Amino acid sequence: AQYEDGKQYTTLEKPVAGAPQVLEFFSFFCPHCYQFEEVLHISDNVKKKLPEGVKMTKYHVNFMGGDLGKDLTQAWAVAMALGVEDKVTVPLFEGVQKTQTIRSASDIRDVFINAGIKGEEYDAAWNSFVVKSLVAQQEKAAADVQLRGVPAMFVNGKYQLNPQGMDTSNMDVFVQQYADTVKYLSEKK
């Protein structure tokens, strides 16, 4: 497709050194993310359009979710370390926006246990330094890229994607165009 700076994507003047290939931010407390995750399946589409060698990274923000928003950021880090992020993505989104049963950190812990993660193992990771540093990096990245919206994707910490500069007439096009822009930027610099 056609890609021009200022419309589909925008190059940041302040690049993030040592940033991953595909960085995406989201929050289970944000319905805007649920729409991009389940309705549009942006992440899923991108993961398949990305060439071999490019890994994706999904971070949780702390400015969306009130107080418990921070707790879920820590929980998400554990999911990433265990490798059950995708598996818990759906139940976490549902339990926060649909059922809204997840009110405390104890509720989040239960989700992991139900998925198949032992409480002891989870709790051990919950109190692990590895996870703590992951939480810090999650917010640090967002603060470095000057995150304005919750659901946003950054390629190599240099190119920022703009959804307001794409097709807003056909959902199919938007989803494909977005992922196409990501891939172009990934195979760019």
Ligand SMILES: O=C(O)c1ccccc1NS(=O)(=O)c1ccc(I)cc1
């Ligand atoms: O939801 C938004 O804020 C948004 C902003 C820009 C582009 C799309 C957005 N949402 S959406 O992708 O789910 C969407 C796309 C096309 C149409 I018509 C309505 C919503």
